Amino acid sequence: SSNLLAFPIVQIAPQYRIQRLDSWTDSKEDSVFITTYGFIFQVGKHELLSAAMLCLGSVPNVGDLVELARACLTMVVTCKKSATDTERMVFSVVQAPQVLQSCRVVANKYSSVNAVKHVKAPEKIPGSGTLEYKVNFVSLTVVPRKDVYKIPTAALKVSGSSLYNLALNVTIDVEVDPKSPLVKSLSKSDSGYYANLFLHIGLMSTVDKKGKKVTFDKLERKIRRLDLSVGLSDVLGPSVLVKARGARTRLLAPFFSSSGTACYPISNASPQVAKILWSQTARLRSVKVIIQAGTQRAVAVTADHEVTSTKIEKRHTIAKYNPFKK
Amino acid sequence: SALPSSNLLAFPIVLQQIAPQYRIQRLDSWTDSKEDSVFITTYGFIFQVGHELLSAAMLCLGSVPNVGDLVELARACLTMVVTCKKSATDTERMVFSVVQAPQVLQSCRVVANKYSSVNAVKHVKAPEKIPGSGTLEYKVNFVSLTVVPRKDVYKIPTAALKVSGSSLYNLALNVTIDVEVDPKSPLVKSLSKSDSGYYANLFLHIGLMSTVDKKGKKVTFDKLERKIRRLDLSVGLSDVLGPSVLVKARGARTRLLAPFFSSSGTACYPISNASPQVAKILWSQTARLRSVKVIIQAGTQRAVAVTADHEVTSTKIEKRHTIAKYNPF
16 A cells, blocks of 8 residues: 555555654654655646655654654645756645644745655656645654764765775665566565665775774774664665664764764665655665775775674564554 | 667666667757767666676766767777676765777776766666676667767756855756657656657756846846847757757856856756656657746745746757667667
């Protein structure tokens, strides 16, 4: 049923799901992030163009959370194409419930986002006419605001001839009917289908000591003491969560919040993986920590070195929706 | 299958011999500038080796000087050895290694450098299908040349495309694009339908104009409709930089509009940046402009949300400038 979020790549109840991250860190739960999913209709006839996603920001953790989710359905939102350097979709908030009044989108009264990351098929969205964005799915994440820390892009773009590029080779088991049109773009394994995602997660030195030179010994040892665990989530749209239990070298520090966490929205890492995850439940299959050369030029002519795996947090997945009570 | 033969470039989104095909677009009469090069855009497929087809991809090599039988300079492109791997920085990257390349190619940006690292979702059809390790090969199977002055192919810099402000208007183009496509090919689910088949939509930011003048009030729309009529835009399709929208202003630019055109009055918008899903559809299908409308939007995204778009006029459609069918070799 949440499988229709693949539209148009393919008697319809509103659904919700809550993910609790209270335990991820001992940071105190304090916030509830809201990500809505639904459909773009061309008003007047009334025709479904495309599935879409819209993060609202977050509100304080209070009250019946299932109520909060109900309230998210009574938003009235329209939208239109715009562009800057790329195509944007601009959502106008026409009506919102009181409990949403402090969140980013509702207080601003609009949200302008990259079109490809938030609309299944922007090519099917016309350049004019009135468009309604109908909220049908509400995904909530209870989490300390502190812990949801997106790495600034400037930081992800640092490179150096004597740095290694720390990445994860991430495979994601996605629950999908073997007969869905989506299967065409996934890999198959004896068990089922997975999606591949390569993610740059930090920087490591080639050089020990302000002398040279670090070895495959003390990089396996540096990373193990970092002690990484990785999961999936909807805060910020479909996202990879990474946590280090061990202190960060000087270099790794911009890649983790002060409570050791980082959230990588897949929308930015791999926009196609992200939109598959709008429609399908999914859990992490494996996450192998990779060291690559520290500049793209070097990466071309040098072999990747697989170090180890991370713990997979099996509680942190893209979970199944539930319909509203009668 | 006897269809465009490019149709396989939609892999793995295909309505399911492999035939190195090629194509030449010439734009030597587009502009005044003394001609300088042939830009090269290659399309093919990425193979796991352990020959297993994973997805189609595209790679721009840059440009080389105009001499010789360009139909052989094309055959030459077929004979590269190219390896590829995933990487990432901010987003997933596809890294291509030019392991070897004919001598006629050594000139261009990519072979000189021996590598290209590119935004994955823009250059690979299903990056979700590409393993994070192993030995992968990229086989060039389609070569698309564009004869045009380098001076003329001007990408507007990213920062200038993002300038916005409350006393500016966002000048944009409501572009619709006719794509020739098998009525049972899957691509169709994603396009818009018409009597004349199916078309894709693209909204493209193209320039800035002032809301006031000068030390002013409030340019009236009649003043803004006149300046645009003057600009005298003509718009076309091309592969110069992977599928692009070519925009030419024949009339004078105002102060704000000036950075949005080369000094021959041209500008090139890779669709890969504007709308990645549209650019990838134009890998495999041939296509031509259906309509291009010039729209004034408010000058910030916040005000766009509350302010009705204003359609000013149509542009000329440069009907010779298309994503043109390939040929056998």
